[PDB]
Amino acid sequence: NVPHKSSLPEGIRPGTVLAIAGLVPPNASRFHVNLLCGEEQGSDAALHFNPRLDTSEVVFNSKEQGSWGREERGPGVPFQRGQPFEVLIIASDDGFKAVVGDAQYHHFRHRLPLARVRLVEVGGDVQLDSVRIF
């Protein structure tokens, strides 16, 4: 289950849009999208977006110096085993707006500097159709 990696050569800014389309496999337990601050294993995560099919929830968090912050959770779980999905992660000045299925889902206020984000990683139990940066 190797995680997908896409570099952000000039990082991201208010107005950057990450569009991720995929399918949750029928036996899926969980998957994630990470906005990381570099290529090092264990690099800080400005945003950890973690749909959990097994525990019926979506967890948001950040990671800094190897320790996880306090979890935030969205309402319910807008993902279904066997079903395709489209997520938008939109950077603004205040944080990240996660859009799922054409509806605003959660707003994660910035914990780390947005200028530190350099890499998108997608891992876990997910079939990745496309990652696009607008």
Next chain:
Amino acid sequence: SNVPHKSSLPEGIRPGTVLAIAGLVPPNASRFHVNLLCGEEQGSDAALHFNPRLDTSEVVFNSKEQGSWGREERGPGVPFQRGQPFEVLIIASDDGFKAVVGDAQYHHFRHRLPLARVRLVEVGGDVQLDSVRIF
């Protein structure tokens, strides 16, 4: 055909706002528009006028301020077709508006009016509107 469609934005929009517009260009369409307007009055100032012209095969970008239009900019050819559906994103940044069409970057329009002046999104002209969403 959902038109003219108005989405009021009383709190305005900021950098990181995404306007997703989907619809059908009907068989004999001449042109349609997406306007980011500064108020509800007729002839209001426009931070952005996005104007696909099927009849002349151009896409024009412009602004209107103090009742006067600015200098038009033009995108690269026309990524719309009579009889075909489309998906547009208009993305606001600190610097301007990025127009995405069919999942490909199409044009960047540098801000001419302060983004903070925008109060309303209007869609009109020869388009059968599917959905207008603002994130």
